[PDB]
Design an enzyme around this catalytic site. Structure first.
Site, PDB file in Angstrom:
ATOM      1  N   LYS A   1      -5.516   7.021   7.413  1.00 18.88           N
ATOM      2  CA  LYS A   1      -5.449   6.688   5.968  1.00 18.88           C
ATOM      3  C   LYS A   1      -5.284   5.173   5.806  1.00 18.88           C
ATOM      4  O   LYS A   1      -5.980   4.578   4.992  1.00 18.88           O
ATOM      5  CB  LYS A   1      -4.301   7.442   5.289  1.00 18.88           C
ATOM      6  CG  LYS A   1      -4.376   8.960   5.325  1.00 18.88           C
ATOM      7  CD  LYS A   1      -5.278   9.463   4.294  1.00 18.88           C
ATOM      8  CE  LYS A   1      -5.488  10.960   4.345  1.00 18.88           C
ATOM      9  NZ  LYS A   1      -4.453  11.652   3.565  1.00 18.88           N
TER      10      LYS A   1
ATOM     11  N   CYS B   1       1.081   2.234  -4.420  1.00 15.36           N
ATOM     12  CA  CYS B   1       1.520   3.654  -4.508  1.00 15.36           C
ATOM     13  C   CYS B   1       2.650   3.666  -5.539  1.00 15.36           C
ATOM     14  O   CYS B   1       2.363   3.340  -6.724  1.00 15.36           O
ATOM     15  CB  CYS B   1       1.883   4.282  -3.155  1.00 15.36           C
ATOM     16  SG  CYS B   1       2.403   6.037  -3.212  1.00 15.36           S
TER      17      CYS B   1
END
Length: 157
Positions: A81, A101
């Protein structure tokens, strides 16, 4: 008068590259000043309707590489990722790009630290920048991830 509100832990990383926590509608007029082409989004949760409308109105592309939250001492940063995000980050056609995030410390911190390793920064300098944002929530597992990250496959870019 003092009307612009950068998102949580907002910073310019480099020309065309920003980091933050999760933007809310209070941060949209500030994000508009950056002329973003892209967001690199590292949470697994679907982007909220508010944020989707902001991206549509501003022509911003959403790249999602969802990394599940983990607590020390069970931190597992998914190498794949981070590397998919780094591939998007290194393409100037995606710039200006905001990495976020939730808090702008951990997933965000790992992705930026791996960029710094590609930029040939010494580990102590990478760790110092990581710690500046993470502060009391600095994780040894995030710095270990950066310490062993093999830059071989990105060395040519």
């Amino acid at each position: 008068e003092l009307h612009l509100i950068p998102p949580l832990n907002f910073s310019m990383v480099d020309n065309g590259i920003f980091r933050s926590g999760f933007p809310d509608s209070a941060n949209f007029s500030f994000l508009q000043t950056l002329g973003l082409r892209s967001i690199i989004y590292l949470c697994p949760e679907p982007y909220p309707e508010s944020n989707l409308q902001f991206l549509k109105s501003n022509g911003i592309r959403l790249f999602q590489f969802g990394i599940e939250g983990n607590k020390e001492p069970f931190v597992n940063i998914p190498d794949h990722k981070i590397r998919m995000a780094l591939k998007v980050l290194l393409d100037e056609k995606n710039h200006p790009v905001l990495i976020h995030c939730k808090r702008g410390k951990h997933r965000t911190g790992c992705l930026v630290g791996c960029l710094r390793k590609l930029q040939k920064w010494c580990l102590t300098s990478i760790f110092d920048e990581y710690q500046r944002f993470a502060a009391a929530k600095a994780r040894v597992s995030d710095q270990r991830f950066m310490e062993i990250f093999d830059v071989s496959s990105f060395s040519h870019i």
